[PDB]
Amino acid sequence: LPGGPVPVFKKYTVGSKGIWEKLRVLLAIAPNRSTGNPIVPLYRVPTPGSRPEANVYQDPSSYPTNDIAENPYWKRDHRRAYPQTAFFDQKTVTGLLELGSEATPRIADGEAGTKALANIANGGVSFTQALGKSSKDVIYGEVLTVNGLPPVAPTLAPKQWKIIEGEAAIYPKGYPCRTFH
Amino acid sequence: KSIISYNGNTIEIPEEYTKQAPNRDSTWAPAQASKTEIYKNNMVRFEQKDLSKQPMPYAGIELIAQQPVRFVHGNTAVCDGANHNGPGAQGHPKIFINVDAPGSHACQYCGTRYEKE
Amino acid sequence: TNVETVAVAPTILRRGGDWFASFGRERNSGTKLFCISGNVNEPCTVEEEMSIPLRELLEKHCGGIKGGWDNLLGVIPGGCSVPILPKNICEDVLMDFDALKDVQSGLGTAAVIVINKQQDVIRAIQRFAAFYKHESCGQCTPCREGTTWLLKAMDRFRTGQAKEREIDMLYELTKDIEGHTICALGDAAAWPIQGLIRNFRPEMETRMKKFHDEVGAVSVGGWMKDARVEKGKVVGAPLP
Amino acid sequence: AEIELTIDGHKVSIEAGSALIQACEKAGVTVPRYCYHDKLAIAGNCRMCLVDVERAPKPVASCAYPVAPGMVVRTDTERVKQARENVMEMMLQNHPLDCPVCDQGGECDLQDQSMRYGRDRGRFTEITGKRSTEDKNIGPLVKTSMNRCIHCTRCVRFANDIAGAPELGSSGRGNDMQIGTYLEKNLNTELSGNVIDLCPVGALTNKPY
Ligand SMILES: Cc1cc2nc3c(=O)[nH]c(=O)nc-3n(C[C@H](O)[C@H](O)[C@H](O)COP(=O)(O)O)c2cc1C
Ligand code: SF4
Ligand code: SF4
Ligand code: SF4
Ligand code: FES
Ligand SMILES: [Zn+2]
């Protein structure tokens, strides 16, 4: 309906003459049909070897990029600012349970806090031991959700769906394919 | 003309084709391999074949030597070899030449020799 | 040691040293010879006190300015390795080490070089750039590359073959040179540009806007649309 | 008799009185350079080993800063990361456009060095251009295109001190500095060709190869 049928004088096609056009309007399935040949003095003129637009053409560029004075490279660097591959042992998750988090730590006594760190960093405790050690609020805070629900397998950008159905659909009913979007 | 085909037998090609070039008869590289070596190597796949319709591609060492040696008013010359008709970036890149020593100095891409005067 | 600071030494042993310290600032103490020149009435050199106003200096002990206190445009305290003080600061500034560093500048050798308003500051700084080009040794890659870079920048700025961005391009090149030299000559090479940048930024633009309709428009780097490389040298561009 | 300090968190101990760049080599933190060398005298001409030093007003060269205890060496200060791009860019405004004809194509120390730390662009687009240097005939062994030289002094200190042919030398100030005899006379010490492995650009290179 914004992309519906348009008549054949806006289709850029070789067309017809005028008594044969009057013939073929009476003899066609739809009159608004192109015979497929593009129009010769329009399509591919002037040839790409001779384009007057191609004579002056320096460079496409953007303003914070081509700015000579202000930026250095290292602010607009992108290859050396990659995120690190965050790896997690079995053991460091036990560290995340009992020692706590940078949001909510559970550790004072920064001298002996290193000692409480290090045996777990050497394998003093086990994970299931920490699970029994972890409180109900600990499990429902940093393992499950606040209702104690399992986290849904998370998605980048969730795309909710419409179903276009009516005359804006690409097939009417009877045809089995629907056109959701 | 007549060169020995490794057996005392001589092979006989005209002097129009004992040539490095239509512009030059002599070689210009240490491992140039003159045509007198080449027909000596494989005339096996050269028999029953025309001698005319091979390239003979007009070697460059004769053509560069008859270009006029240009003059530069100041000290440091610039060479591009780029046309001023072609809308683009052609020629060799913008290197500079010091011309101070007695004698001309070829721009190491284009081979045009420049002189300080 | 400076010949001056060792030639003052016998007198200051002969006189009172704290008596010498009874002058100027607490720290910036005593006297200095002031080689005062530029466009004055009386080019002279006086042995006078530190921490003194420039106006009382010039108006009383070097005659005046050719065209008066109006006709100054800027002043260079010290040698050439000092940024130019503009008109509003130079009226009420002491000649010590403190106030000039406070206006981000050096007292130098306390030569005073005043500048005619009816003359060209861009010539005055371009000559300093080529002064440094004749007198860089060549240990530092920054200094040796720097001053021949600065010189062609200043010539292009003098005729006006630049764009408006390129003056701050030069400012970043100034601080590129500044802290990265073995001897302090790069520090010397830096500051006369920064005086021009901080105090004459529309003044350069007036020359450049003038050049923009003297001839056709210019691209970056001085290249014009007809500035081309023909047989041998370049053509089109009028060679700063 | 040894000194332990900190380079980028890495504590490292090295013999006293040595150079900081050897401590950076010992710590494993790679610091680029152009005119340091082990077997040669130390000159700070290259300006590449700039590095941040606690208790220092400005970043200093790591080649000639002597090792002092209680040292905190930082290499990734944004001032230093600015500085390396700066100095590379300053070096690359008189070096000529010879990368497809220069001999050290993949072996240009400068070039691989200018890929990590070089600028995107280079704003040399001045009209009247770079300097340029005489051919400087030396001998039938050493190919010589002094235009590509950067005066990194690494040739002349060697032929001075260890090779013992003191004919090489620096003549002139600024861009009028050259390297070599301006007699145009033949160099020979009995290890003559060792400079073409030593000039990190292809200013001096191999004449038969
Ligand atoms: C490039 C440069 C050039 C200098 N030229 C001079 C000079 O010509 N006469 C002078 O007395 N000091 C000159 N100085 C400053 C000297 O280094 C100065 O003698 C020293 O730093 C301090 O000496 P003093 O205690 O006697 O003031 C120059 C400094 C630099 C960085
Ligand atoms: S600042 Fe001094 S040492 Fe460095 S290159 Fe310039 S003149 Fe030489
Ligand atoms: S030394 Fe310079 S010109 Fe030669 S290949 Fe390396 S970067 Fe290119
Ligand atoms: S001759 Fe070669 S190694 Fe020596 S300073 Fe010059 S470019 Fe460097
Ligand atoms: S070797 Fe460190 S500055 Fe040249
Ligand atoms: Zn050329």
- Touching subunits of C (3+ CB pairs, under 8 Å) are A, B, D
Check if the beta carbon of residue C37 is closer than 8 Å to that of residue C112.
yes
Rounded Cα distance, D27 and A8, in Å: 77
According to DSSP H, which parts of chain C are helical? 3-7, 9-14, 17-20, 54-61, 87-90, 98-102, 121-134, 141-159, 166-178, 185-199, 201-214
Tell me whether residues D78 and A68 touch, CB distance under 8 A: no
- Asked if omega into D200 is within 30° of 0 (cis), the reply is no
B27's tokens: 């070689």
Residue A55: HSE in the Cβ half-sphere, 13 Å Cα cutoff: 6
Q: Which of A68, A74, A76 sits opposite D81 (nearest CB)?
A: A74
Nearest to C186 by CA among C130, C152, C147: C147
Range of the domain at C50: 23-119
> Does D198 fall in a domain?
no
User: CB of D108 within 8 A of CB of C205?
Assistant: no
Chains that touch A (3 or more CB pairs under 8 A): B, C, D
The amino acid at residue A127 is F
The tokens for A99 are 């020692």
* Nearest atom of ligand 1 to the alpha carbon of C2: 26
Question: Which residues are CB-contacts of A163 (< 8 A; sequence separation ≥ 6)?
Answer: A178, A179, A180, A181
Q: Is D35 in the pocket of ligand 5 (CB under 6 A)?
A: yes
Amino acid at A18: G
Q: Which residue from C94, C75, C105, C103 is spatially nearest to C28, judged by alpha carbons?
A: C94
Q: Chain B partners of D135 at a C-beta cutoff of 8 Å? A: 98, 101, 105
- Atom of ligand 4 at shortest range from CA of D198: 3
What type of residue sits at position D86?
Answer: N
CA of D97, closest atom in ligand 3:
3
Q: Which residues contact C183 (CB under 8 A, 6 or more apart)?
A: C137, C139, C140
Mutate to test the pocket of ligand 1, among C2, C128, C139, C181 (most ligand atoms within 8 A of CB): C2
* Nearest alpha-carbon partner for C125 in C209, C208, C44, C190: C190
Closest CA to D128 of B83, C240, C123, B92: C240
Provide the residue ranges of all domains of chain B, joining segments of one domain with +.
1-117
The half-sphere exposure of A127 on its side-chain side, counting CA atoms within 13 A, is 7
The count of residues in chain B is 117
Atom 5 of ligand 2, nearest CA residue: C140
Q: For residue A67, which residues of chain C lie inside 8 Å, CB to CB?
A: 165
Residue of D89, D98, D112, D145 best suited for mutating to test ligand 3, as the one with most atoms within 8 Å of CB: D98
Contacts of residue D201, defined as CB under 8 A and 6 or more positions apart, other chains included, come to: D95, D102, D104, D108, D109, D110, D148, D149, D150, D152
Is some CB atom of chain D closer than 8 A to the CB atom of A62? no
Nearest C-alpha neighbor of D191 from the set D169, D153, D162, D152: D162
B76 vs chain A: nearest CA distance in angstroms?
27
> In this structure, how many other beta carbons lie within 10 angstroms of the beta carbon of residue C94?
18
For residues D65 and D24, give the distance between their C-alpha atoms in angstroms, rounded to a whole number: 12
Task: Residue C132: give its domain's CATH number.
Answer: 1.20.1440.230
- For residue C185, give the ligand 2 atom closest to its CA: 1
Residue appearing with tokens 């038969």: D208
Listed in sequence order, the residues at least 6 apart from D87 whose beta carbon sits closer than 8 Å to its beta carbon are C141, C142, C180, D47, D48, D50
SS3 C145: helix
Q: Using a CB-CB distance cutoff of 8 angstroms, which residues of chain B are in contact with residue A57?
A: 87
Q: Which phi and psi angles does C36 have, rounded to 5°?
A: -110, 125
- Which ligand has an atom closest to residue D159 CA? 4
Ligand 5 pocket test, pick from D47, D58, D86, D91 with the greatest ligand atom count within 8 Å of Cβ, gives D47
Identify whether residues C152 and C216 lie together within a single domain: yes
Q: How far is the CA of B70 from the centre of ligand 6 (A)?
A: 12
Residue D49 labeled ligand binder: yes
Pocket lining: D151 vs ligand 4, CB cutoff 6 Å: yes
Is the Cβ atom of C183 under 6 angstroms away from ligand 1? yes
- Burial pattern D71-95, b for ≥16 Cβ within 10 A else e, equals bebbbeeeebbbbbbbbbbbbbbbb
Does C1 count as an annotated binding residue?
A: no
Chain centroid to CA A5: 33
Nearest CA in chain A to B87: A55
* Structural domain for D120, as ranges: 1-189
Q: Yes or no: say if B97 and B83 are a contact pair by the CB < 8 Å rule.
A: no
